[PDB]
Every structure is written in structure tokens, then in C-alpha cells.
Amino acid sequence: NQLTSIHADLCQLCLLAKCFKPALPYLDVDMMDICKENGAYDAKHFLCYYYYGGMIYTGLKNFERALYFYEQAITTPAMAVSHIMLESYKKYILVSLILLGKVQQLPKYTSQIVGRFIKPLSNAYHELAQVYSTNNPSELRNLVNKHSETFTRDNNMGLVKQCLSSLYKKNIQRLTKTFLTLSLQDMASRVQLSGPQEAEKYVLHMIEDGEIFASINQKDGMVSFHDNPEKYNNPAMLHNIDQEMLKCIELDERLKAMDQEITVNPQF
Amino acid sequence: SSNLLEQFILLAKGTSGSALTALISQVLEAPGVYVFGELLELANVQELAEGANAAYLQLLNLFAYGTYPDYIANKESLPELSTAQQNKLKHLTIVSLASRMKCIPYSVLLKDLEMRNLRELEDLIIEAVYTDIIQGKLDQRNQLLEVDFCIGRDIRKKDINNIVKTLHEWCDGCEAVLLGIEQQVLRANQYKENHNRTQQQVEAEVTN
Amino acid sequence: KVNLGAFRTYPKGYKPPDEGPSEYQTIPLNKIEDFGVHCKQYYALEVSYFKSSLDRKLLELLWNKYWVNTLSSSSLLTNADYTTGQVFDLSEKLEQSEAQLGRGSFMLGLETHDRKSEDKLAKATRDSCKTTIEAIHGLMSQVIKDKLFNQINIS
Amino acid sequence: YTTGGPPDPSDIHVHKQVCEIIESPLFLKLNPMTKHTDLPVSVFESVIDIINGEATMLFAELTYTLATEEAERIGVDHVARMTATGSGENSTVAEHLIAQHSAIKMLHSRVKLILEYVKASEAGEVPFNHEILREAYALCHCLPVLSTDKFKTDFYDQCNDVGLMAYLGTITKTCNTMNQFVNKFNVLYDRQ
Amino acid sequence: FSFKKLLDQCENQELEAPGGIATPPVYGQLLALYLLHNDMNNARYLWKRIPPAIKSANSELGGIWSVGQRIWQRDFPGIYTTINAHQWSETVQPIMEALRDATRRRAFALVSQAYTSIIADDFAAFVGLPVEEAVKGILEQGWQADSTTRMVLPRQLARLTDYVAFLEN
């Protein structure tokens, strides 16, 4: 799994032609050590590859890989502002707001332009994470129509729509830690779903996707919220650890060859 | 016992007739004799029939092939026992189910031996531990009985094939594991030799 | 190097007033000041080697009947408190490595001699691998037992 | 061992008392003349064989080698030289694998000694005895020991505990080589 | 999987044989295979890739997308109504037949894992079977069925030795 200028252009073809099937064998495995011999890469290809690759994991319901892809395009240092760096920080907030409730901090080796120029220019995205911590669907709807002019000029339409449904799913998972068997009528007041009939339809979508495990008790008009009865004692879990450890022993062997090469060349 | 088995096989081959009928009841009454294979295949007990002589032949077959429920179903046709012959039949019932299955649940022994609790059911099993008859362990979580060592009832003329089959997998099975351990030593030793050579030749060229 | 050496401490009334180190080895930078003073209390001797003894001949007759105890392995349950207790000491070593990388032992004017214990990240690696090798060593004694006896079954 | 030359019939009666101690003894004879390639020594093993109906304990020569262990050669060379030894490989992994490699070889010999014992009683060698069959029937019946649902839920639980600790220790070894490469790359190649 | 091999062999011919615009019958095979695997994300993006001149000329592609519209909304009574309306007699018929079996299997794993006391009047609209046939098949499996209420109650050594020498030296 190597990287080059050809691999960066392959991700651009998947953006125009909406078909993420060929982009699966070339993105499911992490890549390292680019192919270099006479010069075939540039700084613009390293920022356009991570920006185009993050959009594939976003639509594929793969938020675990989308957060890592969008983080590499921000940590790259620069001297001024650019269109790629601006769209990378705006999408970093919308992705982190779906998984957790607050935006993750930036590393120490990040660029200073993001925290001095991109941060004040992205005032419409920074205020969105402040209201998300309060968990209020009435106040979140007022920010969509207010910042509608900013989401259209920055071609960010569709990414903010996933955060609207994420607040309703977060309130259901929040009641699982506090409450246990809440009534169907009481669940339509905190989450605000207008009627108990709309509450039974929203909880059924999380069962098919696998975000939470619950059981609807129609005999009493309530709903139960239990945890996952998995002690991780199946023999299939041991094979996942052995398969994941095969990539750790290979990454250390590759770093030993690069460390001996630098020691051969004279340094200060 | 073991010295008493060589005395009952010598008196049965010297006399016959009415003296053989009285010798069958003396073997089952005297403790220590837990084998009945060398006395059933003989031609002395086969000649006992017609009347009370035929009841002793059927009783010897139930003590080797039958179990405890097989005796209570025909107690009117077989002679009665005492306080020692009844307890000896319960020892053969435990070793009978162990020859077919490795683990026997407690619900099976509670129905065959007709008990009500677990200690009274296991009371006849622990008595055979000190006499080197039944040796094993008791399970409480799974409510099973893992019988490890037990008597072979008769002289083992039908289940003798499992003895050589179990020992063949223990001797031939060690050769397959030995090839994997020996191959792991050569792979681990070769990795240390290649790492020591690649770490000394790359550090000596730094000064030049 | 096979370190081996016999010494004999002189009693009261026979210690030399000045005597150099007869058998000098390696000493870490902590107790090196006491080596130049306590060396006059004893002296090294030229060690030799020969073949005789008697204890190395009766251990074979015992192994004919004591071989049932040599297979008592399963080190994962013997010193189980030492393996778990070693992870608590590793957390204290990892916390010291975070302050070493943040402050840095390479300052202006005086470098590679600022902190007391340097290379905290390199020393914490061997301590983390010690809890891993000792953990998998006890498992190897159990897997080898499930491949020679548990793989037999019965008909 | 003994000093003499050609094999004498008097040494056969002395070797018979040695088998009563160890199950696999060895014989050695020193010859003043040449015989092998290096030192004039030869090792023999007690091999019994029938000769015209009479079973005699003969001998069989073998070909010996050098040191077959790195952890042992470093201790033998330091004894005869009585000076110093060169720094080589201690083989720490080989010092721990002898506990499991020798256990299989020791268990493979114990099964072979009892395999021919029960097989001889069934064929025609050992006479048909009811005491031998009743003492070796339930001996192998206990196999396998503890192979039910109680051991299956405990063996997989112990493997997952040490398996997770191996992942946290493997990532620490990679960070050691990564720190040596980062410090050597951010100075010569990078200047910021 | 058996049906997963047909999807991988169909995408290779889509990016090799056509030079710009593909063929209608191939677009119907990729959209029908994506609906069986319950992958609405790849099925929605594939429908947008088709130019509008192909959808307006080929009426067979409109019937396939009509069944996929109810899958995104996850409406069980709305699946069987769209299947028996627009069908193609070529390569979609053997694929559309397997889609009806996946709908009943999807409700079996969803009701038995979220509805511990499903209503018998509403359970018939989730599997397609009538009310007189839904209460009969559940009794042969193991699920109870109450009366006068219409309520149904459903529900190694080679790897360890390699890590020893790797971490030690």
C-alpha cells in the first residue's frame, strides 16, 4: 500500500463519479513510505489527498477513519491561508460533533495559521459546538437558518444535516446512563419528538444500525434500555488481537531499516 | 483384594455339582471381589439350571452387564441380598455409565440409585475411593461427575480396543508437537544471529 | 562475560594501609566512591577449575521418581501478584518520561547533562516489555499442556 | 567408562548392574591407538540381542559432535582455558525454551515404555493376566483431563487477559525505535 | 458470500468496456445488487451517477429505484407494494426474487431484538404474511402467543514464539 501522485488523482475520480467501490481496497489498509526515485510528489498533493479521502469515510458511516484523515490535513504547517486548509478545519468540527460532544484539541506541531486566521474566519462553526454541549433541539434549529449563507458559499451543504439527527440520537444514549425503563410519553418531552408515536419510530432506526440496544415494551407503554451482554469471551476476539498484532511487529521492523539509513549518512 | 481372586478360580475347577452352587453365593457375599469375568465364562456355572440353580446364573450376568435398575425390576425372580451384596451392586452401577460417557450428570444417578439428596448419592461413591476402586473428582458448578479411574467390571474382552487406541494417540501425537517446538527454536535462534550481524556492520561504517 | 572471582576479607590487625583494586569491574555512577576505599579490606585470588565433586551424581537417581514435580509449570498462576504489581510501577516510570520529553535535556550553554536520569523513554521500553514477556511465558506452559493431553479425546 | 581396548566378555556382566539404576546407560572405552578422527574416544550403548538363542548385551558405537548449545559452550570454554572468553551470543530465548522442548522428549519416552507393555499382553508375549488388564483400562480413560464447559470458559478468559497486555507492550517497543528516528531526522533533514 | 461475487465482477466491466456512457442493462444490475446487501449509501450514490437522459428513456430503471426509496425510510409494509408493480424480464428477475427474502429476514432480526411484546395486528404488516398466517408460523419456532389481546412475545503457539524473540532482541 504505497502512495504517490497517481493515488491522489484516483480519489478525485471518485468525487465526480459517485462510486466508492474502487476506493475500498486502496483505503481500507493504511499507507506509508511513498514511492520516490526521481521526484513525483508535491505539497499540494498531500493536502488534496487527505481532504478527498475524508469525504469517502463520512458518507460510508465510518467516523472512526474520517477523524484521522481530516486531522492530517490540518497539522501540516504552512505560511498563509488556502482553500484546502479552510475546508479541512470546517469539516473537522462537524465530524467530531457527531462522535463526541466537543471538538478535539489540536496537536503541538500543528500550524499556527489555523489558530490565528482560520479560527476567527470559522466563527459560524465554532458556535455550533457550544450549543451542542447543552443538548437542546430547539436552539440548534435556529443556528441552521442563521448560518445558511455561510454553509452555501463554502460548499458545505449536506454535512451539517447529519448533526441535526445526531443530537436526537445522543439524547437517547444519554438517558440510558441516567434512566433505565423510561415511559414512551416521558421520552417525547426531553428529546422533543411531538407525540409518543414519533418516539417508537426513531428508536427502531438505531437497532438496525447498531448504535444502541433497546427493547420496546408495548404491553406497558414503556421502553427498556439495557446494555450489551457481551463479555468478550468468544474465541473470535482472540483472533482479532493476533491479527492486529501482526501489523505492529511489521511497523517496528520497517522503522528499524529507516533508522539505520540515517545513521549511515553523516549528521550534526 | 487381589489375593482372593486366585483362590476362587482354583476351587471351582476342582469340584462341581452341589458344591459349585454354594460357592457362587460365597463370592458375592465376601467383599474384595469386584471382577466376575473369569467366573462367568467357565463351564461350571453354565451347568446350573432348572430351579434355584438358574437364579444364580442370571444374578452373575446382572453384576457384570446389568445395572441397579435392572435388578429392582425382577427382584421376585432373583434371590434377595443382604447389607453387603446390595452396597456392592451400587459400585458397579457407577463404573457402568463411565465406560460409555466421560461425564455423567447428577440427575441420572439420582434416578438409577433412587436417592433424594447429593450427599447420600455420593456416599456410596466415596467408600470406593479408599479401597482403590473408584477414583475421580466431584463437580459442583456443572453438576456432573468426571470419573477418572474405575474398575473394568469383567476382564475387558469387548472394550479392550480402546486401551491401545488411546495409547497410540499419546505416542504418535507427541511427534507432531515435537516438530513444531523444534522448528520454533531454529526460527528464534536464526533471528538472533541475523540481528546481531545487521547491528554491528551498520555501526562500524559510521566512522569511515 | 562470565563474572567470577573469590575474595577474602582480612581480619583485625592485618589490613594493608594502601592497596589498589585487585579485581576491578564496572560500577554505576552511585557507589563508585566506596570501591576505592573498601578494596583494601580484601584481595582477589587466581581462580582455577577442575572436575570432581559428588553432588552432581545423585540427582539422577532422584529424577527417576521426582519427575512428576518437574512438570509443575503454569507460571501464570504462581507469581500472579508480581506481574500485576509490575504494571503499577510502570505507570510511575511513564509519568517521569513525559516531563523528560517536555523539558528536554538539551538546553543552551549546558546540554546532555541537565536532568539526573536521562533516556527515560529508552528505559521505560524495557520495563514495558518485561510485563509482556513474563505474561506470555506463563501461557506457553499452558498451551503446551493442551496440545499433548487435551488433543487425545476418547472414542 | 573404562580403560582397556577390545571389548571383553567380563565387561558385559558389569554393565548389567548399571541398567538397574538408569533406564538408558552408556558405555565408553579408551584406546591408546587411533580409531576416530579427533580424540581417540568412542561412546557405546547397551543393546541387547539374541545369539543362537542366548540373549547377550552387546554394544553399538556412535558418532559424537561438539557443543550443541550456545548457553553451555560459553561456560565450558571458560573452564578449560582458565583465562578469558570472547563475547558472543548468550541466547536468552534458548535458555527458556529448554523447559518445554525437554518436556515433550521426556513424555514421549514414558508413553513408549507403557505402549509395548499393554500391547504384549494382548498379542501373545505377556501371558493373559486379569490383573494387568484391570489396572491399565481406566489409566488412559481419564484423557482428556478437564475438557468440559468449565475449562472452556476459563482457558479463553486467561488468553484474552495476556493477549491485551501484549498489544500494549508491542506499541511501546515501536515507540523506542520511533524516538531514535525522529531525533535523527528533525535535525539533519529538518531545520525548524 | 455467493451474491457478493456478482457485485465485484460487475464493477470491473463498468470501468473497462464503456468509454464514457455505459448501458442501461448494466446500471440495473449494480442497483439491484446494492439493495440486497442493505447498503443504501452506495445505492443512492449510484443512482445519481446515471445521467437524466437514461432514466427518461429506460422505464425499467425507475421501478428499481422505487423499491429502494422505501428502504431508506425503512418501511416494511412499503416494500412488498413496490416489488409487485414494476419488474424486468432479463437479469433483474433472478435478483429481485432474492430481495423479497431479505426483507422478511430483516424484520426477523429487528423485531426479535427490539420488540419484546409486538402486537399481532402490526406484526403481519412487517413480514408480509397475513394475520391468519403470522400467528401460526411463530408457534412452531418457540415464540408464545397470548389470546384476547393479540400480543406476540418473540425474544497459537507459532505466534507466541515469534513475539518472544521480537521483543527481546
Q: Do D22 and C64 touch (CB under 8 A)?
A: yes
- The most distant pair of C-alpha atoms in chain B lies apart, rounded to whole Å, by 111
Q: Do E165 and B180 touch (CB under 8 A)?
A: no
Q: Do D169 and E165 touch (CB under 8 A)?
A: no
> Dihedral (C-alpha) C88, C94, C98, C101: value to the nearest 10 degrees?
160
| Region for B50 from its dihedrals, namely left if φ exceeds 0, alpha if ψ lies in -120 to 50, beta otherwise | left
Contact E86, E63 (CB under 8 A): yes
- B152 in contact with chain D, both atoms CB, cutoff 8 A: yes
Binding-face residues of C in 125-154 toward B, CB within 8 A: 144, 147-149, 151-154
Rounded to a whole number of angstroms, the distance between the first and last alpha carbons of chain E is 43
Q: Which residue matches cell numbers 475524508?
A: A54
Q: Do C144 and B166 touch (CB under 8 A)?
A: no
Q: Which chains sit next to A, with 3 or more Cβ pairs under 8 A?
A: B, D, E
D161 contact partners, CB below 8 Å, separation of at least 6: none
Q: Cα angle vertex A52, ends A47, A57, to 5°?
A: 125
CA distance B138 to chain C (A): 19
- State whether residue B33 is helix, strand or coil: coil
Q: Do E168 and D93 touch (CB under 8 A)?
A: yes
Q: For D173, which of E164, E165, E167 is closest by C-beta distance?
A: E167
E12 grid coordinates:
470491473
Residue D59 main-chain phi, psi, to 5 deg:
-130, 160
Q: How far apart are CA A132 and CA B167, in angstroms?
A: 70
Q: Do E163 and D92 touch (CB under 8 A)?
A: no
- State whether residue B120 is helix, strand or coil: helix
Q: How far apart are CA C47 and CA C39, in angstroms?
A: 18
Residues in A touching D166 (Cβ below 8 Å): 241, 245
| Bridge partners, residue E119, by sequence | E151
CA distance B191 to chain A (A): 12
- D17 in contact with chain C, both atoms CB, cutoff 8 A: no
Residues in D touching A243 (Cβ below 8 Å): none
Report how many Cβ contacts below 8 Å link chain C to chain D.
83
- State whether residue C45 is helix, strand or coil: strand
Which method, experimentally, gave rise to this model? cryo-EM
- C75 in contact with chain D, both atoms CB, cutoff 8 A: no
The Cβ-side half-sphere exposure at A6, using a 13 Å CA radius, reads 7
Strands D26-30 and D2-3: parallel
Number of H helices, E strands in chain B: 9, 3
E81 contact partners, CB below 8 Å, separation of at least 6: none
Q: Which chains sit next to C, with 3 or more Cβ pairs under 8 A?
A: B, D, E
- Tell me the C-alpha to C-alpha distance, in Å, between residue A16 and each of A10, A20, A35: 11, 11, 26
The residue type found at D136 is A
Q: Which residue matches cell numbers 467516523?
A: A63
E84 contact partners, CB below 8 Å, separation of at least 6: none
Q: For D148, which of B5, B98, B142 is closest by C-beta distance?
A: B142
Other C-beta atoms closer than 10 Å to the C-beta of C129 total: 19
Q: For D144, which of C60, C67, C153 is closest by C-beta distance?
A: C153
Q: Please give the full DSSP string across B37-53, using - where no structure is assigned.
A: HHHHSSTTTTT--SSTH
Nearest chain D residue (CA) to B183: D101
Contact D46, D59 (CB under 8 A): yes
| Bridge partners, residue E144, by sequence | E153
Q: What is the CA radius of gyration of chain C?
A: 26
Nearest chain E residue (CA) to D94: E165
Contact D169, C132 (CB under 8 A): yes
The full length of chain A comes to 268
The Cβ-side half-sphere exposure at E110, using a 13 Å CA radius, reads 21
Q: Which chains sit next to B, with 3 or more Cβ pairs under 8 A?
A: A, C, D, E
Q: For A238, which of D159, D174, D185 is closest by C-beta distance?
A: D159
Nearest chain B residue (CA) to C144: B177
Question: Do you find a cis peptide bond into D40, omega within 30 degrees of 0?
Answer: no
Q: How many Å separate Cα B110 from the centre of its chain?
A: 20
Looking at residue C111, the DSSP 8-state letter turns out to be: B
The full length of chain D comes to 192
**Nearest-CA neighbor of A95 among A58, A120, A126, A124?**
A58
C141 contact partners, CB below 8 Å, separation of at least 6: C73, C74, C75, C76, D99, D100
Element (H, E) at B104: strand B103-105
- D133 in contact with chain B, both atoms CB, cutoff 8 A: yes
Residues in C touching B166 (Cβ below 8 Å): 152, 154
Long-range contacts at E88-97 (CB < 8 A, ≥ 24 apart): E88/E28, E88/E60, E88/E63, E88/E64, E90/E25, E90/E28, E91/E25, E91/E28, E91/E29, E92/E28, E92/E29, E92/E32, E92/E60, E92/E64, E95/E29, E95/E32, E95/E33, E95/E36, E96/E32
Other C-beta atoms closer than 10 Å to the C-beta of D16 total: 11
- E164 in contact with chain D, both atoms CB, cutoff 8 A: yes
Residues in E touching A207 (Cβ below 8 Å): 110, 113-114
CA distance D144 to chain A (A): 20
Q: How far apart are CA B7 and CA B39, in angstroms?
A: 12
Q: Do E160 and C140 touch (CB under 8 A)?
A: yes
- Tell me the C-alpha to C-alpha distance, in Å, between residue B8 and each of B4, B18, B38, B62, E57: 7, 16, 10, 19, 103
C49 contact partners, CB below 8 Å, separation of at least 6: D79, D80, D82
A159 grid coordinates:
454535512
| Bridge partners, residue D46, by sequence | D59
Q: Do D177 and A259 touch (CB under 8 A)?
A: yes
Contact B8, B27 (CB under 8 A): yes
Q: How far apart are CA C71 and CA A121, in angstroms?
A: 71
Q: For C150, which of D78, D82, D147 is closest by C-beta distance?
A: D147
C115 grid coordinates:
536532568
E119 contact partners, CB below 8 Å, separation of at least 6: A218, E150, E151, E152
Q: Is A5 exposed, middle or buried (0-12, 13-18, 19+ CB in 10 A)?
A: middle
User: Please, what sign has the CA dihedral across residues C85, C87, C88, C94?
Assistant: positive
Q: Which residue matches cell numbers 556382566?
A: D13
> Dihedral (C-alpha) A32, A35, A36, A41: value to the nearest 10 degrees?
-80
**Nearest-CA neighbor of B68 among B98, B104, B112?**
B112
Residues in B touching D114 (Cβ below 8 Å): 167
Q: Do D173 and A252 touch (CB under 8 A)?
A: yes
| Bridge partners, residue D59, by sequence | D46
The residue type found at A219 is K
Contact B199, B205 (CB under 8 A): no
Q: How far apart are CA E84 and CA E101, in angstroms?
A: 14
In a mutational test of the B interface, the residue from A249, A253, A261, A263 whose CB has the highest number of chain B CBs within 10 Å is A263
Outline where DSSP puts E strands in chain E.
Answer: 118-119, 144-145, 151-153
Contact B8, B39 (CB under 8 A): yes
Contact A30, A70 (CB under 8 A): no
The residues of A whose Cβ lies within 8 A of any Cβ of D are 77, 232-235, 237-238, 241-242, 244-245, 248-249, 251-252, 255-256, 258-259, 262-263, 265, 267-268
Q: How far apart are CA A150 and CA B119, in angstroms?
A: 81
Q: How far apart are CA B88 and CA B93, in angstroms?
A: 9
CA distance E123 to chain C (A): 48
| Bridge partners, residue A225, by sequence | A214
Q: How far apart are CA A42 and CA E154, in angstroms?
A: 60
Other C-beta atoms closer than 10 Å to the C-beta of A190 total: 15
Contact B112, B67 (CB under 8 A): yes
In a mutational test of the D interface, the residue from E157, E162, E166, E167 whose CB has the highest number of chain D CBs within 10 Å is E167
- D120 in contact with chain B, both atoms CB, cutoff 8 A: no
Q: How far apart are CA E25 and CA E95, in angstroms?
A: 13
Q: Do D163 and A242 touch (CB under 8 A)?
A: yes
Other C-beta atoms closer than 10 Å to the C-beta of D83 total: 7
Q: How far apart are CA A187 and CA A175, in angstroms?
A: 9
Looking at residue D143, the DSSP 8-state letter turns out to be: P
Q: How far apart are CA E125 and CA E137, in angstroms?
A: 15
CA distance D142 to chain B (A): 4
Residues in D touching C142 (Cβ below 8 Å): 155, 158
Contact B37, B10 (CB under 8 A): no
The residues of B whose Cβ lies within 8 A of any Cβ of A are 198, 202-203, 205-206
Q: Do E169 and B184 touch (CB under 8 A)?
A: no
Q: Which residue matches cell numbers 479411574?
A: B149
Q: How far apart are CA A16 and CA A14, in angstroms?
A: 6
Rounded to a whole number of angstroms, the distance between the first and last alpha carbons of chain D is 75
Contact B153, B64 (CB under 8 A): yes
**Nearest-CA neighbor of D81 among C2, C7, C56?**
C2
Q: For D174, which of A238, A244, A251 is closest by C-beta distance?
A: A251
Q: What is the 3-state secondary structure (H, E, C) of chain A?
A: CCCCHHHHHHHHHHHHCCCCCCCCCCCCCCCCCCCCCCCCCCHHHHHHHHHHHHHHHHHCCCHHHHHHHHHHHHHCCCCCCCHHHHHHHHHHHHHHHHHCCCCCCCCCCCCCCHHHHHHHHCHHHHHHHHHHHHCCHHHHHHHHHHCHHHHHHCCCCCCCHHHHHHHHHHHHHHHHHHCCCCECCCHHHHCCCCCCHHHHHHHHHHHHHCCCCEEEECCCCEEEECCCCCCCCCHHHHHHHHHHHHHHHHHHHHHHHHHHHHHHCCCC
Contact A215, A182 (CB under 8 A): no
| Bridge partners, residue A215, by sequence | A224
| Bridge partners, residue D86, by sequence | none
Contact B62, B71 (CB under 8 A): yes
Looking at residue C56, the DSSP 8-state letter turns out to be: G
A5-16 and A43-59 helices cross at what angle (nearest 10)? Answer: 40
E62 contact partners, CB below 8 Å, separation of at least 6: E55, E86
Long-range contacts at C34-41 (CB < 8 A, ≥ 24 apart): C40/C15, C40/C16, C41/C9, C41/C10, C41/C15
* Helices marked H in chain D: 10-16, 70-80, 92-122, 130-136, 149-185
Burial C75-105 (b: 16+ CB within 10 A, else e): bbeeeeeebeebeeebeeeeeebeebeeeeb
Residue A183 main-chain phi, psi, to 5 deg:
-70, 160
- D181 in contact with chain A, both atoms CB, cutoff 8 A: yes
Resolution of the structure in the document, Å: 8.8
The residue type found at B10 is L
B205 grid coordinates:
561504517
Q: Please give the full DSSP string across E12-50, using - where no structure is assigned.
A: HHHTTS-SSS--HHHHHHHHHHHHHTT-HHHHHHHHHHS
Nearest chain D residue (CA) to B34: D134
Report how many Cβ contacts below 8 Å link chain B to chain D.
100
Q: How far apart are CA B150 and CA B116, in angstroms?
A: 24
Contact B95, B150 (CB under 8 A): yes
Q: Do D170 and A233 touch (CB under 8 A)?
A: no
A234 contact partners, CB below 8 Å, separation of at least 6: D156
Q: For E158, which of B180, B191, B192 is closest by C-beta distance?
A: B180
Looking at residue D123, the DSSP 8-state letter turns out to be: T
